[PDB]
């Protein structure tokens, strides 16, 4: 499993999505920290 | 990273994927006793880089 | 047995697969502590 980033991807005859599974608690902080600089008191 | 957030500092809160380097302050309130056995409450800036 | 890491493995002719059974409590510290350097605090 690889990470292609670039242009637009197409799938190829043999690739699949794979779904990258995040432990829990990380998820939480991506959606609420979009900047920590300023969302910073809670 | 598991940090501590809070005035009175409490140890496993504000976890963040983040580590700031900038010259920022944690106020946390902390409670002495002088010489005198007269305990008192004092907060401190605390200005970190 | 043995442990295939790598390429997508396909079963052989005389192969079948092995369920590792990890001692009771190992269970729960694998699928808790994701991440104890930050999950420390429980
Ligand atoms: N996600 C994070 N990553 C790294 N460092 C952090 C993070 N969150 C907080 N910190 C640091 O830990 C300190 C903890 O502060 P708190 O006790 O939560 O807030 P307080 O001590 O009351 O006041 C700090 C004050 O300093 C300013 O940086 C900030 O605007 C805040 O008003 C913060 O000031 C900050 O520098």
């Known amino acids: ?4 980033i670039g242009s637009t991807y197409m799938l190829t005859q043999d690739e699949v999505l794979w779904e990258k599974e995040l432990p829990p608690g990380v998820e939480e902080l991506l959606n609420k920290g979009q900047d920590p600089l300023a969302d910073r008191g809670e | ?9 409490r140890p496993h ?15 946390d309130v902390i409670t002495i006793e002088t010489a005198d056995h007269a305990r008192l409450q004092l907060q401190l800036a605390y200005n970190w880089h």
């Open chain 2, 13 to 27: 809160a504000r976890r963040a994927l983040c580590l700031l380097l900038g010259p920022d302050f944690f106020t």
């Open chain 2, 1 to 9: 990273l598991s940090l501590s957030a809070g005035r009175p500092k």
């Open chain 1, 1 to 4: 499993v690889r990470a292609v």
